[model samples]
Target: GHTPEEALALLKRGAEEIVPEEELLAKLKEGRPLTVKLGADPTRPDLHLGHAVVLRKMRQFQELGHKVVLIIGDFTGMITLEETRENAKTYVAQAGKILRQEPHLFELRYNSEWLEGLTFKEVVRLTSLMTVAQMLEREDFKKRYEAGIPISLHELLYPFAQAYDSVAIRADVEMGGTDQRFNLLVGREVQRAYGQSPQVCFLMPLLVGLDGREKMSKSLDNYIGLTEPPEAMFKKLMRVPDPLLPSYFRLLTDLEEEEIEALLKAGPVPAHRVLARLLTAAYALPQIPPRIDRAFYESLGYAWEAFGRDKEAGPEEVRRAEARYDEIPEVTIPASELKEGRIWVARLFTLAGLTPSNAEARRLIQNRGLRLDGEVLTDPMLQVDLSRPRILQRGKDRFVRVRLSD
Candidate 1:
């Protein structure tokens, strides 16, 4: 319900760039709801805080009464069609954690709706819209080209296909991370070519990963997965570099500048605690039909901080948080598989689904990465009693509870 000026400021918070800011201002001034578009690549089914950088912006649009269209880029040839559909389904479900589901406020789209139907002639026309010189203008393309790396022909078509999405959807504004600047700009040009008004390009800063130097990515093992358990999520966020705390709070939370400044002044520990608590609640809490109430989310946040404050309480925190928040995925081991009421530690870890193979389970034990009920397991040959359910933890993020079934 804010005026255009107020709305612009609110929307622009933490954003890296808003191309031709005046156009966005003008669109807001016009008083009609804007069609804000964001594209998702479904090759990876899991969403992390890095993805949230743009998604949260989409939610901000929804809060302001604008329509946000989520374009699932399923037509992209990055994966097989069946796999693409399945991944998209999982992606959309996870996205629901952050986005509002109000029918009027949220709209879902698959680029395949338009991209797959494009005839050879139409595709050639799209290709004609941009030159090879223009394609190389993208930073990655330029860097690879300069380094004598192979630039596949199909790779150049991606920007155009993405641009066509903007034209097809008639997007009033397009949102993406700063790394997507070139592709987003291509949308503006393509929209103009299609005789539609260009969309305002809203770019958010790419979230730095746990490494604090590189962009958050799963392949790099620096990401905080959105679907991760609250304890895992909180632990990772708490360890985020002190220098990055300000941006973490600014980009990941709705805290005001004055408040974030105060947190910064207080120290990184307090700021990280607040950031970890809020985000863990925001992403880790299970969704019910009625939607999770704000108070419960706040309470979950406090719960994380409760056991998270002490360095010596690492396992205690994970154990405590799991008891309350995580379901601790369960696995059943047949009583027939046990010898004399006991099971080999290696076999136990493997059967519990904590490791891929008994050999790998043994390797983890040697490395001191295997834990049973939070105690390190050092003997690969040692047998574990399976009289009752036990929690087996592999590394810090994965947990599985093993139960004996007669």
Candidate 2:
């Protein structure tokens, strides 16, 4: 048996909270491999540092001789899916590169393994265990409800469907981000209702993406994707805001606590450099050193500290093309046509052939694809200045370098 307390301290290191630490310790004392559970959203199809935060935690459990059940969440994704069995194969492979790094744990499952075969009565019974009022208590639902926004019946049912997943798997411990706490807690209640021991709830702090503001995510364009190229990955990490390095060091790296603190005390510039190298080492990439003596931030195509940030995050493939200037399919807009050196972002999207019209452009921007001058634009009505040459990237490969001709 492992030294339960010692192992618990290691597990608790960067975690936001571990529900009922004693229960977890007791479970550890049992000396059997605990079933550690994690669910990946299939819709995303991209893995990043945000995903790394949890998978790295899972790695610790695996290294300690525990089982890791990686739920592919296809049932959840099927509710809103667009893919192939091949897509899943690639998805798991992209993420599994790190997830499968260690031994003592190897179980990949589709939620549909048991979920797709459930009887209607089974579904009804699961739903009956909770109430509409209880469902409304979720933060998003409360806001939408009080604001008189329509909450679809299917949307409310999503949590219960996910709960059924916990019950189906007999999850001993369910892990999710801070945002999923309400759902994970509800999972425990639903499991108890089904007469199974409630799974321990493990919540990890959400890592902010390269932008240093919003939560790290593929759709948001702020993410550092797992499958990114070695040089590109190194470049993105180097561009992360100076302050976010400590968490990046603590959560995403295997550094000791005191070492991380010492690095942070050394200040932001050195901290970011150390973090960049450490992650690149873990990523096993030949990380090139950053050089700032350029006409623009060469890799990022903007001036460091004089510009913004973003990334080219997307699906995994054996060969993801990099569209250079020759293949960018250029569409130029003259400077004299400028509305005060400004252009509506959605229209710009249409001009680049990325989207059909402004409305769809709005949806794309809202979905987090439109990167203007290296910044991820969240607003559909946002405007960009044409005062300088701009780089607009759609994903990892395709990019446009726009110039204003007088």
Candidate 3:
């Protein structure tokens, strides 16, 4: 379904305008296949549609018989998450599975190998390549700085560390979501300063969050993980609103524009079917396995005929179909879990898995956006009974039951 001209056009349109088009095209024409680079921060253990947007593009290069370099920001993970150095092995294992699934076409590297051993002098040398204003220009850092948020010194070094990855790989082209434009450009800048040709930077459009308004993120509960059960993945795809359908089609599937346009004009059900088929095929999973639960499908607004003939619900279907309630299931106890009788709500939120980080938890609470047992709690110091189950609410849609034991 892909032609060289179309691929070239996509490369032109999806890449950052600042990238030198002549150099990129010249590199493409001069080579057997250009080495494409894609980097991921393994903060979360799973790959979501947000991740798949870039991964899918990388696969396009691979299918074209190009060299693809999939860089896991393992070292960045150490500094970013404060995770153990050994955890990079586990991160690679998870990432390798996803990368190997399509075909064996990529070379994998970890940034930690170089970054972890950096001396103070070396780090200073790296930092000297860029300015304070240049680093602060990033939207995330700038917004946090403007709001007097505690932006970590290590966070400011993230771009430098990432740029070092480009130098390490000598990547011909680098790709990422539009949110990563600043970071990608930093790679090019750092590479140029290091005396390498500026890397071609490609910034693809962001995938709409499952909520259909925000960007898809795991913390937002609006992401579809690659390893998520097929039924759950299918249902989540169905919930994506009509306005986001086109974006989803473009980002998540191999569907052509003409086919997507026809499906869009056909109405929601047809478009929904097309989404299911595209996802199932993309993942190489079985065709929506027969015996899909009719009641569950109906609850999701899918007609019984959509799956063709109703069948008994499986245990997996029953579990996913049930709404999460404010009840805790028995599990092993961790003595370190008890933070005395008082704990920072942000820290508690991380312990409760309701938020990905203490910083995010703090933001929600400070915004008067977090609730406990349906009552809003604006104080970051507010502590709830963790010894027993209590409803911990984040924003409007996210909920978690906290259970603590000594």
Candidate 4:
């Protein structure tokens, strides 16, 4: 059995921030199973390392003999992908598929069971605890606001609806990504309004996607599905940047700090294989059939070769290949137009005849396969600057020269 100190240490290892930790500790000393809560909107069907970071922490609580209340934000899912009306149904179906694939790992609960029945008056009472300004302060909301993106009233209700989940469950502690600080705190606010003790908040950092810079997302295409094939998993693991390895190790694997450090020092290639094996084991991949390795190599030599090139590429190559570009051209844009700040790294590559479309540009960005002027461009929205010449690249072989004009 894990002692309180051990449990606390494990929690601290996984958490980026914990609200009122001292008070929470006092309560924990009373020998209660911490009612740990984590909510997922199921906005998408796939689960990546980003979701795993929080899920893994919840697993730690379960290991410590605590109760984990997982809230599948089914109600929120109704409006999660407001643009694509089809997302709500698709999300639930995909979420079901993912959950079924990992049935042994997560305990699930749906929010629609409660939220769907709430009256307008009850929603008003719950949302009254937060102000419009408070809702606007949320990063996603704020970004939308800054970008002149519309914020639907339904989007504003998301947090309160999420908070209502905590109130319903009477959760003692709530967990989420750092970006969710406002929403998690709203849970406490709503819980208090319902005459329950405010829940402690635990927020973890966003997991950098395989690209090593952007937030991991299924839409971004910078994610490795938990249910991906073992060889594909190994290949993707090899693509993430070295700087993100430690965080990935902490969030996704059971490797000790010392062991992870040793692997890091062993360099990217070896460290990546170590991650591949660890993930495969964690997911309980079936044993490789005898001689299948040889068959795989013979049939998929290009993939194996690409993986090796990724391991050996120099810092300069890695940097330029990773930079972002906007408005990448489908036809040759003159080198003169490639001047600083004006050059679209994506277009430069397209002009060089690398990729075929903006959609392909997005795909390359999602895969962490494109580089800008020697730096990895993980964000698809990231723009190129003319102050410096940017080299555009796709994978290891395709390279483009972008000369900036003053």
Largest lDDT belongs to which candidate? Answer: 1
Q: Give lDDT tens digits, candidate 3, residues 1-406.
A: 4455565775553333536666766676664667788876666656677876666566656656677787777775654444543455555554543453333567866777777888999889889988888888899889999999898887888888888889988888888877888988888888888899888887778887878789888889888877676667767776788888887777666455776677677778667764654463344342221112234345444343433112232233432332221044233225465567545667777777778998888888888888888898878766654656667787777787766553
Is candidate 3 or 4 superior in TM-score?
Answer: 3
Candidate 4, position 18, lDDT:
91
Off by over 4 Å in 1: 286-406
Assess candidate 4 and give its TM-score to the true structure.
0.63
Q: Which candidate is the best by TM-score?
A: 1
What TM-score goes with each of the models?
A: 0.72, 0.69, 0.64, 0.63
Q: What C-alpha lDDT values do all the predictions have?
A: 0.81, 0.72, 0.67, 0.66
User: What is the number of residue pairs that collide in model 4?
Assistant: 25
Better-scoring candidate (lDDT), 3 or 4: 3
Worst 10 residues of 1 by lDDT: 288-297
Ranking under TM-score, best-scoring first? 1, 2, 3, 4
Q: For residue 281, what is the lDDT in candidate 2? A: 40
Give the local distance difference test score of model 2: 0.72
Comparing 1 with 3 on TM-score, the higher-scoring candidate is 1
Error of 4 at 164 (Å): 0.8
lDDT of 4 by residue, 243-308 (tens): 888888777665567766776776787677545544543443332211112233223221332433
